[PDB]
Automatic annotation (TrEMBL), chain B:
<feature type="disulfide bond" description="Redox-active">
    <location>
        <begin position="60"/>
        <end position="94"/>
    </location>
</feature>
<comment type="function">
    <text>Thiol-specific peroxidase that catalyzes the reduction of hydrogen peroxide and organic hydroperoxides to water and alcohols, respectively. Plays a role in cell protection against oxidative stress by detoxifying peroxides.</text>
</comment>
<keyword id="KW-0676">Redox-active center</keyword>
<dbReference type="InterPro" id="IPR050455">
    <property type="entry name" value="Tpx_Peroxidase_subfamily"/>
</dbReference>
<dbReference type="Pfam" id="PF08534">
    <property type="entry name" value="Redoxin"/>
</dbReference>
<comment type="similarity">
    <text>Belongs to the peroxiredoxin family. Tpx subfamily.</text>
</comment>
<dbReference type="InterPro" id="IPR002065">
    <property type="entry name" value="TPX"/>
</dbReference>
<keyword id="KW-0575">Peroxidase</keyword>
<keyword id="KW-0560">Oxidoreductase</keyword>
<dbReference type="InterPro" id="IPR018219">
    <property type="entry name" value="Tpx_CS"/>
</dbReference>
<dbReference type="InterPro" id="IPR036249">
    <property type="entry name" value="Thioredoxin-like_sf"/>
</dbReference>
<feature type="domain" description="Thioredoxin">
    <location>
        <begin position="18"/>
        <end position="166"/>
    </location>
</feature>
<dbReference type="InterPro" id="IPR013766">
    <property type="entry name" value="Thioredoxin_domain"/>
</dbReference>
<comment type="subunit">
    <text>Homodimer.</text>
</comment>
<dbReference type="GO" id="GO:0008379">
    <property type="term" value="F:thioredoxin peroxidase activity"/>
</dbReference>
<keyword id="KW-0049">Antioxidant</keyword>
<dbReference type="InterPro" id="IPR013740">
    <property type="entry name" value="Redoxin"/>
</dbReference>
Amino acid sequence: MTQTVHFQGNPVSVAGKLPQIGDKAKDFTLVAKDLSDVALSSFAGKRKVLNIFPSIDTGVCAASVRKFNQLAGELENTVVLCISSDLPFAQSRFCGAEGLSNVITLSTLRGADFKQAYGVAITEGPLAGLTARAVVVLDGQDNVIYSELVNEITTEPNYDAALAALK
Amino acid sequence: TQTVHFQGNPVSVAGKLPQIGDKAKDFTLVAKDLSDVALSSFAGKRKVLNIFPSIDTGVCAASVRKFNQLAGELENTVVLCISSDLPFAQSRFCGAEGLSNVITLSTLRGADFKQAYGVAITEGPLAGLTARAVVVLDGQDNVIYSELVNEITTEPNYDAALAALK
């Protein structure tokens, strides 16, 4: 049913279960910056860092996208996917403004059942309808090699543990 | 359904834009602070609903800045800028541009608004967004003007919209 994360300590309900090491991750379809629909299966044979966050237009989500963008640079055989409920238009504005060329931004504009399938759908309170903060790392065939449902939404995910799984 | 266009290409929009004489449906949308704001909260005020695809595209942005300059001369009126942008996008924009008169609302929640107001882009690349539309409401939520813009890359008719307020 639900996971519990927090916002400045206040409990926030998140539906489903974040995928765990060993699970087969579900194929999903999300909206890329040209408004085309992009399936996880398009990335077959590459590893995938899914950096999931509430919104690129808030501060800690923006920090995680700069960070992963800088880290994507020296990753081997990996795509870094920045995923949220932002419209594709916000996401590309931010990456265009900040010179963040490595990440691929994807929106739940369409393909929203993703939130449900990846256990990141906030279901209650002022954040209901946004994704929680999470990192999922997937191998070339979409097996989970790492995941972290960030306990406190006002803190950044653990970048080093996430990318360790790629080594 | 209804058809409008984007660079000449038909785009279907579900529902039917309310027409003069109709009682507009009571919506609840998401304001900048993530609180849920009902149309009824604006009782006794006229409302200009500026509905567009996204504030982070150029035509939508031009209409928010125009309605915002026009909003300052309006009597007994609130100007609601409505889209499927997240509240955060709407707030970033209005704060960066000094656009302090409009009230932004998002379909983050309260998404039945799109259907109820005949503005839900149904198929194609724009699916999940609102079409471009202006609905003007009286103090009691009757429709005094509406336009479903025929071509999405053109601005709405500001002057006709606001005439209905005089």
